[PDB]
């Protein structure tokens, strides 16, 4: 693998955005072949991020919840077709149709997101909202009426729902007899030798290699924020890239120490399509996203985010390779770093084969100030994600147009905007460090 | 025609958009059957707008310039295929091809807008721009190197160019032997009885029924702005809807007072398609815009704008009907009012036939604040013209998503945004004073 | 009891008012049948509120001071009709008539509030005023001219006076011979087994489950503020809902391990009416508020607030049920939560029988943007407590009008502002995500 290219990419992005620290581990053929730390785990104390640094892993915790569910099913404790009402005291039969365990694992209950995690975490970092659900029990209470929020029968649509996995946590406690955190620690963490993976504040703050979370304010300052303890089965586990390596190894080598291979495969089966089509055909299994078209391979993985911490794990069983990335802020998507490394491992050029990388580079070239014939009319071009904003300069006048890219090339971009029902086009021609923009009746040259 | 309906429309829009005054005239098979003024021609003085109120007509002046060319051509003064260099001393042979009179009239020289008029007027109204071309001579001097601005060969592409008509004005002088203003006055205005159509401020000062222009500032306060004297052949004429009534009559009835009917038809011929598709397949003639599919009819017209004054004239030769509208601000498109009236005259409901009208009504219903489950997350939806903007409420954080309407119905709007290079939908379900928004994983409900 | 309805209520209210954490206990027939903590004890450290969590209880402390006085009276230490001057070195003979122990207990000395507590706490939280009374002895010195502050003869009117209970704390010291803190701990807390109820910071610092106080600033931010140590007899006690359930049990069952039942009945007697009339007839006993018409029952209770902490305790002797709620901010009246629960324990619907509950839900339907015929004029309706404000939009102008709701139903509300000496009426009609407003000559639609 081209380590030089990967490391530059990481440092480049960390500077570009204001990311404090990042840790990464890479598995190949059964062994961890690469594990490094970048930046700081704590800016205030000047503590570096290391391969052993502990970060919140967010929704990566979902796959653990699903694995625990698989084990309980295999031991005959319950059935994937069992209605959730059989295990939890809550109304879950929208339109008369029973939402089952399977529906919850696949976010196909028919109930859109309750926005509970969004409201909760925003408040815990100084935002405007507030949702003090200190325990999953209080979350369930708040969700007493989630049934009335349904907009589709169970099994028809996909709606990423955090509350859904919170209910699965409760289902694990009902069936097993112990607390969710207990079950995960004794049936998964210990048997896998993951000793630096925790749920409790008491054990984390005692560790010596833990990352402090960070949020960038509107002013560009990195503000420290501790983990938002309270979340559990949907995304409350804290861990390191080295511990996630042992976890990924189990899946890749189809190790049957937790469940039989038949069950690991149930988790990797795409059951429903998701709205985030990146490489084409993306779907969802049990607590894992499925990318059947990732550079010629079927990719399996999931992202995580608790606001001041983000992460991503991913593996490709047919190639025996996996990657884990943890970050102490949300400046740059961990999945992108992970996919960059995976692309290099497969022998593909990430700068060319990854849409979100390829698109971002070209669009950045188009940004700047634009002038018409001999400087008559002036314009401003700024990119905000997938969109290109064209704003005519003037303290007192002009408009603003959002442009959608229809064609992206190293030296040419064609976008359209919406004017009177049909699309109006704008073309960007990129050459000798110069950019010609053609829009409607105008011609504008960069600068 | 259902007048009560038309009048309500106009008063309602003038209020909604803060338009100070409007005048309109309607012609039906030979006579002016409706001429009426609305609002104020001068707000500070409390002077009302009347059928005789004088306004700047902007680009409607282009047709006058084109008509004068037709006359000179019918007289053997010049040919439409002659290269411009034959009459004006300036280089106009981009890529080795001669720009002809025909190219100038159809905006097909291959030279995109120089943006001169935008710069000029912006500076004359207090903008941060500045281009003091107080005469067409000065403008031609500035456009000296416009041949190098060319991006296409003559006749292949449409680019609305004001300087193109400034050149036609100079061609009229060279050939006719008199000034552009005198030729237009002597060969068109006078023989058509348009005695209150001027070019010179000295004439305008004498007139007793003249409208002051207005521009709305960043604070929604109407600011008076006088006409920007200096522009001529491309948009410097000032007239009334009654004078334009006599003008439209000539075209409709194919009156040969100035030129043979064969030449009027040359002007109504679609030579090149334009990017202003409203009803489908619109094109450009000579100083006139062609709409081959306007409510099952062929519409001919042209808008005009000098910033503080706007206008429009259009006619349907086959139905012998025409309409003229003048406004002393840029608040509401005069063409929309003119088309509203035309629809009524055609026996059609403008509320169901004109896109720019129902599309505006339907979109308003989606604006407001939306709330997630039990008020967890908040969003505000705002419509700017034809785009729907979805913004998340929070002072610390706040992302805005541009939504483009795809399916538009009375009770359902489906929009899309871009992400990862693919479109992602947002559905708006409108029902009994409330709207349900379904975007990605979320469900948001309005009031 | 319908617990789900109660827990959904609390979470929703905490979200709505930005309350950090709440703890509550419910006692029935001598057993703690329910006790839970919601939200956060300490936001910054992310520690959950629990039934054990300790909070300042504020003026709930007053009932302890009253109980202490009852014991001393029963033991012959003093008389309820004794002038307070007989125990404290201060002038208290407004209008030539001595303020008695009884007068202080009922807030009827004839002396209006000195605003000492308001000034004290305000300054201790970074506010504008300042009154550095670090000890109750200091407050008394400050209160040296209080006699001159009187406006009525003792026993005629009610004026909640915190200094009143400060003087009582000193009286307790004079009679017993020990300090107020020691007297309460040895005579009340210890015999009742209330082992996690404190006065001193040295003790609270050693407790592992304690909440941080919070105050919401003007940007809507929760600002941490530690307990303002210094106050004592009028409201310096810190405790938890589990210890308070033990306290409530004594009154409910009329346990006589501290005083005889005749003295508990003295404390629960309505001696004078209060202006805080919620259900009708509310009065004040001895460090206790009396509600004679609470859902067809006689409720006894008292609230408390120290600024960054609030709480409430209430019990209904006849139904052997009591409730305690503590909060680490003043976002939502803890008495409202307590009464919500008592209503459920009574087989009643709080959503339809508690005024402060439905009135707030209904007045909420009215908030919004209103416009006249085809958008000619714009107005804004915003609710603030009980008053509905109607403002004419438009930057240059934008006057305001206060509207006092006279009639209030599910889909209708009649209010009145004040004109030229007479009441001008406004009516709101609510029907299907729509509200019509008739105000004088105008008709406005939201
Ligand atoms: C968890 C899976 O059971 C879900 N299932 C995955 C595929 N199953 C095969 C299988 O059951 O492993 C296909 C046949 N399945 C028959 C049946 O199971 O009753 C009907 C559809 N099921 C509905 C259901 O679950 O009941 C949808 C998804
Ligand atoms: C049992 C009685 O003591 C009750 N008492 C009967 C009337 N008393 C006159 C009297 O008691 O001879 C007059 C008013 N009394 C002041 C006073 O006693 O001088 C105030 C309130 N009293 C309680 C108290 O005195 O603590 C309540 C009613
Ligand atoms: Lu490089
Ligand atoms: Lu099945
Ligand atoms: Lu030809
Ligand atoms: Lu002739
Ligand atoms: Lu008495
Ligand atoms: Lu005894």
Residue numbers in the entry:
A (entry chain H), B (entry chain B): 1 to 447
C (entry chain E): 1 to 446
Provide passages from the article that reported this PDB entry.
The Pab87 structure was determined at 2.2 Å resolution using the single-wavelength anomalous dispersion method with anomalous signal of a high-phasing-power lanthanide derivative, the Lu-HPDO3A complex. The crystal structure of the P. abyssi CubicO protease (Pab87) reveals a 422 symmetry, where the eight monomers are arranged in a barrel-shaped architecture. In the protease complex, monomers associate through a non-crystallographic four-fold axis to form two stacked tetramers that are themselves related by a non-crystallographic two-fold axis perpendicular to the latter. The 50.4 kDa monomer of Pab87 consists of two structural domains, an N-terminal PRP domain associated to a C-terminal lipocalin domain that plays a crucial role in the octamerization and in the active site compartmentalization. The N-terminal domain structure follows the pattern of the known PRP structures, composed of two regions, one α/β and one all-helical region with six helices. The Pab87 C-terminal domain presents a typical lipocalin superfold that consists of an α-helix and an eight-stranded antiparallel β-barrel. Each monomer interacts with four other subunits of the octamer but main interactions are observed within the head-to-tail dimers, where monomers interact primarily with each other by shape recognition through key-lock type interaction. Intersubunit contacts are formed by electrostatic and hydrogen-bonding interactions between the bottom of the lipocalin domain of the first monomer and the all-helical region of the PRP domain of the second monomer. The 20 Å wide square-shaped channel, running along the four-fold axis through the entire complex, joins the equatorial two-fold axes into a 60 Å wide central cavern formed by association of the eight C-terminal domains. Each active site, facing the central cavern, lies between three domains, the PRP and the lipocalin domains of one monomer, and the second lipocalin domain of a head-to-tail dimer.
Pab87 is a serine protease belonging to the MEROPS S12 family and displays sequence similarity with penicillin-recognizing proteins, termed PRP. Pab87 is the first characterized member of a new self-compartmentalizing protease family, referred to as CubicO proteases as they display a cubic-shaped octameric form. In conclusion, Pab87 is a hyperthermophilic peptidase that acts on d-amino acid containing peptides at N- and C-termini. Taken all together, we propose that CubicO proteases play a central role in proteolysis of these bacterial cell debris that contains d-amino acids.
